[PDB]
Design an enzyme around this catalytic site. Structure first.
Site, PDB file in Angstrom:
ATOM      1  N   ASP A 143       1.007  -0.892   0.195  1.00  0.00           N
ATOM      2  CA  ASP A 143       0.142   0.480   0.269  1.00  0.00           C
ATOM      3  C   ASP A 143       0.883   1.081   0.333  1.00  0.00           C
ATOM      4  O   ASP A 143       0.648   2.094   0.373  1.00  0.00           O
ATOM      5  CB  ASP A 143      -0.889   0.052   1.416  1.00  0.00           C
ATOM      6  CG  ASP A 143      -2.118   0.453   0.584  1.00  0.00           C
ATOM      7  OD1 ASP A 143      -2.257   1.250  -0.322  1.00  0.00           O
ATOM      8  OD2 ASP A 143      -2.754   0.954   1.731  1.00  0.00           O
ATOM      9  N   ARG A 147       0.104   9.686   0.959  1.00  0.00           N
ATOM     10  CA  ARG A 147      -1.460   9.159   1.449  1.00  0.00           C
ATOM     11  C   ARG A 147      -0.695   8.790   2.859  1.00  0.00           C
ATOM     12  O   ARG A 147      -0.952   8.768   4.137  1.00  0.00           O
ATOM     13  CB  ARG A 147      -2.394   9.142   1.391  1.00  0.00           C
ATOM     14  CG  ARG A 147      -2.631   7.561   1.176  1.00  0.00           C
ATOM     15  CD  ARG A 147      -4.365   7.231   0.367  1.00  0.00           C
ATOM     16  NE  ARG A 147      -3.916   5.560   0.462  1.00  0.00           N
ATOM     17  CZ  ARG A 147      -3.550   5.440  -1.102  1.00  0.00           C
ATOM     18  NH1 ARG A 147      -2.814   5.937  -1.809  1.00  0.00           N
ATOM     19  NH2 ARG A 147      -3.845   3.354  -1.560  1.00  0.00           N
ATOM     20  N   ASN A 148       0.344   7.231   2.487  1.00  0.00           N
ATOM     21  CA  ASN A 148       0.566   6.512   3.867  1.00  0.00           C
ATOM     22  C   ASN A 148       1.617   7.203   4.033  1.00  0.00           C
ATOM     23  O   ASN A 148       2.949   5.977   5.410  1.00  0.00           O
ATOM     24  CB  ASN A 148       0.804   5.243   3.023  1.00  0.00           C
ATOM     25  CG  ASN A 148      -0.724   4.708   3.013  1.00  0.00           C
ATOM     26  OD1 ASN A 148      -2.105   4.876   4.033  1.00  0.00           O
ATOM     27  ND2 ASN A 148      -1.660   3.549   2.301  1.00  0.00           N
ATOM     28  N   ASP A 161       0.677   2.974   7.642  1.00  0.00           N
ATOM     29  CA  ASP A 161       0.018   2.404   7.779  1.00  0.00           C
ATOM     30  C   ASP A 161       0.144   0.366   7.615  1.00  0.00           C
ATOM     31  O   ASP A 161       0.227  -0.214   6.104  1.00  0.00           O
ATOM     32  CB  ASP A 161      -0.377   1.936   6.092  1.00  0.00           C
ATOM     33  CG  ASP A 161      -1.724   1.986   5.661  1.00  0.00           C
ATOM     34  OD1 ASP A 161      -2.832   0.839   5.942  1.00  0.00           O
ATOM     35  OD2 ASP A 161      -1.484   1.538   4.265  1.00  0.00           O
TER      36      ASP A 161
END
Length: 273
Positions: A143, A147-148, A161
């Protein structure tokens, strides 16, 4: 080596040592807030705190704490640090490193065109270093996305994350997830950073993201992007996963750019590559 999974890898914290200063909002499993942790040495540090919702199911508890069982296996300056968990009292908590500037994508969107190229390369080098450690441990993140990544008060970026736009073609095609598919994702993060948090492939139909990438189309160079960095993106996005650089090579590439900042002065709709 990473081991697929809680108290083996996470400290049980005494809740007396935890104070909450600020509620951030809702999370997947409960609330998210920040506060302070008093360490056994009496040092006090800022921390991020997340709680498990009241009336949680056993599955929710397992999935929530599962994060800690993974995060706690890593100890690296570019991986979010797990301070510990609270399980012997409720609400159940995970306590992690405080990161003042939050998620990297949203941070960069607030600062469009406001950092130097060397500042951006420093952010990217930190992310690459964290990923080199994760891959050294045999952990495939799956992932990796801006954003992580979280960013602290000194602009140090750390992997956190523990979908389609960030995923390599072979991982989309038949779930072939390897450290080389994380390198693909890293290439997308590189584009995100140099674009100041633009969304990869904007809002293209997912089917078109899959097909275009398969046909050899790639994200275009961000505005004013150094040639060296766009080439690095293209290298991360090689169709043949065996031809992508390893994370150690990515770190070395970025270190050379930091050492020779003049190199960054050479400047470079999807583009067919």
């Amino acid at each position: 080596t990473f081991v697929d999974p809680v108290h083996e890898f996470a400290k049980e914290l005494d809740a007396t040592n935890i104070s909450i200063d600020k509620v951030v909002g809702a999370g997947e499993f409960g609330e998210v807030c920040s506060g302070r942790l008093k360490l056994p040495s009496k040092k006090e540090i800022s921390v991020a705190i997340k709680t498990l919702k009241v009336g949680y199911t056993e599955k929710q508890r397992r999935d929530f704490l599962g994060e800690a069982s993974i995060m706690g296996q890593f100890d690296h300056p570019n991986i979010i640090r797990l301070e510990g968990v609270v399980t012997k009292s409720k609400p159940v908590m995970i306590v992690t490193e405080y990161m003042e500037n939050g998620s990297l994508d949203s941070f960069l969107r607030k600062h469009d065109a406001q950092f130097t190229v060397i500042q951006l390369v420093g952010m990217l080098r930190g992310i690459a270093s964290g990923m080199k450690y994760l891959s050294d441990m045999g952990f495939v993140h799956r992932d990796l996305a801006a954003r992580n990544i979280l960013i602290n008060s000194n602009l140090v970026c750390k992997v956190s994350d523990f979908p389609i736009r960030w995923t390599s073609p072979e991982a989309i095609a038949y779930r072939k997830f390897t450290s080389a598919s994380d390198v693909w994702s890293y290439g997308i993060v590189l584009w995100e950073v140099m674009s100041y948090g633009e969304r990869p492939y904007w809002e293209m139909s997912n089917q078109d993201v899959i097909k275009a990438v398969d046909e050899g189309y790639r994200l275009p160079p961000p505005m004013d992007c150094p040639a060296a960095l766009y080439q690095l993106m293209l290298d991360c996005w090689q169709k043949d996963r065996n031809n992508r650089p390893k994370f150690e090579q990515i770190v070395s590439i970025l270190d050379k750019l930091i050492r020779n900042p003049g190199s960054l002065k050479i400047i470079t709709n999807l583009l067919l590559d």
